Design a protein around this ligand. Sequence first.
Ligand SMILES: O=C(O)C1=C[C@H](O)[C@@H](OS(=O)(=O)O)[C@H](O[C@H]2[C@H](O)[C@@H](NS(=O)(=O)O)[C@@H](O[C@H]3[C@H](O)[C@@H](OS(=O)(=O)O)[C@H](O[C@H]4[C@H](O)[C@@H](NS(=O)(=O)O)[C@@H](O)O[C@@H]4COS(=O)(=O)O)O[C@H]3C(=O)O)O[C@@H]2COS(=O)(=O)O)O1
Ligand SMILES: Nc1ncnc2c1ncn2[C@@H]1O[C@H](COP(=O)(O)O)[C@@H](OP(=O)(O)O)[C@H]1O
Ligand SMILES: Nc1ncnc2c1ncn2[C@@H]1O[C@H](COP(=O)(O)O)[C@@H](OP(=O)(O)O)[C@H]1O
Ligand code: NA
Ligand code: NA
Lengths: 268, 271
Amino acid sequence: PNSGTLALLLDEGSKQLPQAIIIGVKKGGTRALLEFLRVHPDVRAVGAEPHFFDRSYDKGLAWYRDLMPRTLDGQITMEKTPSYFVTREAPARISAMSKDTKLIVVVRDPVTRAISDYTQTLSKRPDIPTFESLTFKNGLIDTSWSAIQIGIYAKHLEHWLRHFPIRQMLFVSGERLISDPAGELGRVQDFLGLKRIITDKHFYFNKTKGFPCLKKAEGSSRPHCLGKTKGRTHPEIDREVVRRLREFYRPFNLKFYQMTGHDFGWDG
Amino acid sequence: PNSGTLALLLDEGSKQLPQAIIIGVKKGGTRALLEFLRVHPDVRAVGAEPHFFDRSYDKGLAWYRDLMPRTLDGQITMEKTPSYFVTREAPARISAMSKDTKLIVVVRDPVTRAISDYTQTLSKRPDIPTFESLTFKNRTAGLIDTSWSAIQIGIYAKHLEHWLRHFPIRQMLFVSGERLISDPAGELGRVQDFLGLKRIITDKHFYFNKTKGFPCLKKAEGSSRPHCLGKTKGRTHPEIDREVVRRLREFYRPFNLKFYQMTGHDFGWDG
Ligand SMILES: O=C(O)C1=C[C@H](O)[C@@H](OS(=O)(=O)O)[C@H](O[C@H]2[C@H](O)[C@@H](NS(=O)(=O)O)[C@@H](O[C@H]3[C@H](O)[C@@H](OS(=O)(=O)O)[C@H](O[C@H]4[C@H](O)[C@@H](NS(=O)(=O)O)[C@@H](O)O[C@@H]4COS(=O)(=O)O)O[C@H]3C(=O)O)O[C@@H]2COS(=O)(=O)O)O1
Ligand SMILES: Nc1ncnc2c1ncn2[C@@H]1O[C@H](COP(=O)(O)O)[C@@H](OP(=O)(O)O)[C@H]1O
Ligand SMILES: Nc1ncnc2c1ncn2[C@@H]1O[C@H](COP(=O)(O)O)[C@@H](OP(=O)(O)O)[C@H]1O
Ligand code: NA
Ligand code: NA
């Protein structure tokens, strides 16, 4: 930055606690949503996952605020930590910071999310058993397995609704974020009270990677596709296992659609 | 950047000759316009002024093309060199590259443009004579020295005739330098339409800096933080004798009027 620019932020720029937070879900497409949102002139976000409300709460709200980027009047401050959604104390802690906090949750077909979760662990520990092996406690599904538990969105949502009004929560379609990024970002910008700037022209589908990419990133004049850890190849899962998992989640999915008022199409 | 990213441009992108060029005018507000346009996801531009059509033409179109950034389909390639507008051979040369090239000219009140031009030189050559001095060939008779570049550049209508002998007025856009300052989002609206770009750059992309006295970008291209133009953009002008300013405005009036008719727009420099 240059003289005038620098000084400007040192005089009119100030750090705010996040007015909006992407609280989940793990493997739902949280990085994608945040990177896309960062294109907007009125959005500033912490680059890394703070993990303040789940891991580092013992550091104080002052430590949290200093982590926030400086913003000019009109700009929203944001951060994303996928684990918040399933953190028992998160709802209460965030509300305490501010009951007016807007919450965004990027959801994904519970089955593909579980496999994605598994695939990420496999990349870190190649010796773990097969996905099929971990899925079953027996023909009984091992619901104590985090990969399965995180997918029961309705269950986690009930906890959040004890501290927040459904209207302060936005549920983003992880699948549509991929098939129609501008579409979902439109809903997100409205929810956040931001003028609809991010549009179709901000994206470019990368055939090679199989996912859309930003034609221009916030931190670059060049295009930007998410890294190699985003969009991992999943192992082929036994169809019978996929069938049983889908059947297990279905009741919870339909309940989730009812609670949120939206059918995400994971069941047709 | 990362693997997939880089690999993308090197595979699906390429360097193309600019489909649109900001050709002038000096001190009209050419840097501001280009920096604002760069916010658009479908615009890629050369950072510096190439000065190809005026100074390095001998290097050929291939060298010129290689100076351009790599673009993805749908993105427009641009550059700005303020001197092109008053460069004798520029019209013919740009036309030979491509008859369909779009041209943008950021104009400004010829009097303030002249004073701005003088001030720039003054900042680099502090011992030059006064503006009033260089303005007249003969002060008493009121004979204005039209050979002086600061005055010459401002006779827009005459330079424009040279361009219209190689380009149809429809392929040229005249941007109000004054409005660019007072309502950048408004001006950028016209520019994007002219360039066939979706109107994305809007009011929210700007932030007025009270200290600098000019609008700034809330976010600059490739940067998450604000961005005002540097110290060389928006210089304080020395006070000019009122009589001299009046005589200069008197000199430009007729040419301004012809320019308004030629462009189909009254830029408001004469009331
Ligand atoms: O990105 C930008 O927009 C930008 C960033 C820089 O901060 C800024 O540098 S600055 O220090 O000058 O502010 C930079 O300025 C460019 C400018 O945009 C160019 N204008 S253009 O030529 O119209 O495209 C250009 O301007 C200078 C010219 O190179 C120079 O020509 S030459 O002499 O080098 O051949 C020209 O000189 C004029 C002079 O201005 C006149 N004085 S007057 O009082 O204004 O009339 C007079 O003396 O005549 C000479 C020669 O005219 S002739 O060539 O027609 O015979 O004007 C220069 C100028 O006005 O600054 O380059 C500068 C960069 O200049 S630098 O010193 O190399 O940094 O824009
Ligand atoms: N443009 C994009 N590029 C890469 N991955 C994207 C994407 N849009 C959505 N995603 C999804 O984001 C997931 C990662 O989510 P998170 O960032 O919350 O961990 C990826 O899971 P997979 O790796 O299983 O495909 C991928 O499906
Ligand atoms: N947002 C902005 N910040 C700074 N200068 C701007 C600007 N918008 C327009 N300008 C104008 O751009 C002029 C420079 O034009 P160019 O970049 O073509 O040389 C400046 O002349 P002054 O220095 O006389 O104010 C200034 O008036
Ligand atoms: Na995992
Ligand atoms: Na000058």
